[PDB]
Amino acid sequence: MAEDGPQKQQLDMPLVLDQDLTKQMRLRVESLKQRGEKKQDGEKLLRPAESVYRLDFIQQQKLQFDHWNVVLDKPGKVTITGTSQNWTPDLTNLMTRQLLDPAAIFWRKEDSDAMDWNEADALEFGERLSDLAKIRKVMYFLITFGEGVEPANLKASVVFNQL
Numbered sequence: 001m002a003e004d005g006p007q008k009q010q011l012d013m014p015l016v017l018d019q020d021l022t023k024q025m026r027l028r029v030e031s032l033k034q035r036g037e038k039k040q041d042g043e044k045l046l047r048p049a050e051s052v053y054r055l056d057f058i059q060q061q062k063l064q065f066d067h068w069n070v071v072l073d074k075p076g077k078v079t080i081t082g083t084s085q086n087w088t089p090d091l092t093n094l095m096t097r098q099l100l101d102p103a104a105i106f107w108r109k110e111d112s113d114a115m116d117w118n119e120a121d122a123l124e125f126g127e128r129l130s131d132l133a134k135i136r137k138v139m140y141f142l143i144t145f146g147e148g149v150e151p152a153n154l155k156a157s158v159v160f161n162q163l
Helices: 019-035 119-135
Strands: 009-014 050-056 067-074 076-081 103-109 138-145 154-162
Touching: 009 050, 019 050, 019 138, 067 076, 067 119, 119 138
Parallel strands: none
Antiparallel strands: 009 154, 050 138, 067 154, 076 103, 076 138
């Protein structure tokens, strides 16, 4: 019974990129080449356009996913690929066929202020995220920067309904 006015409160979680963390992985690969490792069983090569985003689930369940909204300073294209809470690139070698369901694609055109994305592929990953999220207070997402996006000009804000 809120007396202020707003009946249902709302809370948005700003996911933030981790470009510096991406550079740290590259340094480890450079050290490996000095002694070589013959990693031909499955070399893990990330693209300089891959940054790691981190999300902190502050509430155990009062939070609810309403509508993810990603904002870019300029139009363009970005690919978000999800990973099993177990297949981690640092603990496992990045494999293309061992990826779970395909990655969702979000893109904003110049005459469009709204981005069009695959709701069907994203919707399936929505409910799956609803569980693994209640058990893990933090989750990392991989994003790819296309052409026309400056390094840190990416901001990801998702609106959630707090009960």
